[PDB]
Every structure is written in C-alpha cells, then in structure tokens.
Design a protein that fits this description.
By secondary structure, the chain is of the alpha/beta class. 30% of the residues lie in helices and 16% in strands.
C-alpha cells in the first residue's frame, strides 16, 4: 500500500517507505528482463531496465549472447546503481549449459575455474547474485561437473557463503532432479517455471521440493506474451481471472510461498498475439504485487 497506483519512481520519504516495505515480511516479485529487448541494446527496443517498478524485489539480467556492448556498459554504470537506489536486487541469469561446458575440465580445479569465470559476470557488474536455469536432465559426468560448480559458487553466493548474495535455482522440472538433490544446501531461492500449467497441479510440484527448503524460498512463475513466442495464455483478460493472478493468490496447504516471478517482464501488459514492441508502465507487475500483499 506504500507502493504507487501508477509507475511513479518515488524520491524522498515516499522512497524510504518503499525501501522499508522491502526490508519487511512480504511475498516477493521477481522478473526476467530480456537483455536483447533493453533500449540500451541494438535498435528498435521500447523498454529500459530504468523503467522497472519501484516495488519490484529482484530483476534478472537474462541475455541471449548477441546484445551490443552498450547494454553491458549501461547495466554497470547506470542501471545497477539506479535499481539499487530503489532497493531492487539485480541477478545475472545463466543456463545450466554454461556449467556442463566440456571446454572446462571436469575436475575440482576445473569446477573452481568455471565458478571463477561465472563470478566475474556478478562481480564486474556489481550484481546481487547468480541464477542458474535448469531445463534439462544431466548424464553422470554432467551432474558431477554442475554439482562441482555449484559447490564452488557456494563459497561466494547463497546460504553457505555468509555474503548476503543470492544463488538461485530456476527450473521447469521437480525436486526429484538429481542436480537439485546434490545442490539444495547451496540455494537461496528456487523458482519453478510454471508457464501454462494447471492451478490444481501446483501443490504436487511444491511437495516435490518442500523437504529441501522452507516455503519462503519457493517462487512460481508465469510468462508475459513474448513477440512471436509461445502462447502460454498466462496473462488472459480479465486480469483477476488470469493464471498470473491465480499464482499471486495460490498458497501451499498450511504455508506461505516466497512469491512469484514473470518471464519477459519487458512485455508486461502487451496483448496476446501483438508481435510489435511497446513501452510498458508495468501495470500487471504492480497489480500482482498488490494481489500478494493486500
């Protein structure tokens, strides 16, 4: 309720109330900002990470690897300080394919070498942590390499580190995954990509993780409509009947989840099937924060 009814960026005592809100108990909101869609990358983009709403908890930097150098300069010099001034954490996302890359030795020294290279993506930009996107099964050698890299990362990130920085596991699979069984003690938050899924199936998925976490570590995700992308239908109108809204309201039996996240937060409020790029005032993101924290 200290949060704006529009996309105002607060400045004084009004900002302090938002910074205080974020230090208190609340269900959190995270968003994946597609880096190649930022106005500081390439041409034709409409949204800047500077537009993100004051009441966001975590912004993920999610690149595809063809971003212009201008994006990375802007992130380091402009975006991270500005987002930090709003009490928004900024986390780098990487795919699990980066941690199982056979160019890196599958040995203790190689796990540390690869962890060191991943930590540069956090430290060189002043970020708040690392998010690993796990969307495939692993063979025995891949599981050994990924587990080694997580254990090396845990010296600098996540609950084993004592640094306050985050180590996040985001996944479209469940708590039976061998990698999860190997690395759960290193994890800050676990984020379940739940695009297009049944509300009746959420407790099953949560139950596969709940022995390995507390409930406040657990976030479920919906997707905005990506231009030319999958029609998940998570953001149908009317909003209060959407999958995204039902996710904001859902709770596991007898516990409180950590919150929700969006994929492609840069697309907040674009109609399903509209393949043009548009500015956003983050109406969905802001309304969903109010749905979770009434």
């Amino acid at each position: 309720s200290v949060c704006p009814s529009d996309n105002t960026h607060a400045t004084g005592a009004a900002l302090q109330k938002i910074l205080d809100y974020k230090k208190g108990d609340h269900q959190i909101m995270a968003g994946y900002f597609r880096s190649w869609r930022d106005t500081a990358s390439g041409t034709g983009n409409k949204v800047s990470m500077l537009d993100l709403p004051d009441c966001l908890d975590i912004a993920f930097v999610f690149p595809e690897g063809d971003e212009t150098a201008s994006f990375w300069t802007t992130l380091k010099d402009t975006y991270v300080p500005a987002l930090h001034g709003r009490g928004i954490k900024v986390v780098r996302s990487v795919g699990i394919a980066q941690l199982i890359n056979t160019a890196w030795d599958n040995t203790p020294a190689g796990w540390q070498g690869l962890a060191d290279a991943l930590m540069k993506t956090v430290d060189d930009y002043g970020l708040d942590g690392l998010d690993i996107d796990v969307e495939q099964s692993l063979n025995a050698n891949q599981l050994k390499q990924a587990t080694g890299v997580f254990n090396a990362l845990a010296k600098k990130l996540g609950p084993k580190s004592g640094t306050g920085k985050l180590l996040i596991f985001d996944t479209n699979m469940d708590g039976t995954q061998p990698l999860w069984r190997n690395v759960y003690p290193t994890i800050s938050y676990v984020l379940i990509q739940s695009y297009g899924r049944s509300i009746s199936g959420l407790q099953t998925t949560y139950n596969s993780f709940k022995s390995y976490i507390s409930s406040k570590q657990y976030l479920i995700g919906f997707s905005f409509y990506e231009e030319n992308g999958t029609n998940w239908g998570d953001t149908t109108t009317p909003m209060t009947s959407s999958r995204a809204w039902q996710y904001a309201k859902w709770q596991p039996s007898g516990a409180t989840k950590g919150g929700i996240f969006s994929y492609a937060i840069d697309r907040d409020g674009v109609a399903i099937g509209d393949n043009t790029l548009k500015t956003t005032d983050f109406t969905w993101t802001r309304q969903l924060i109010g749905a979770m924290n009434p």
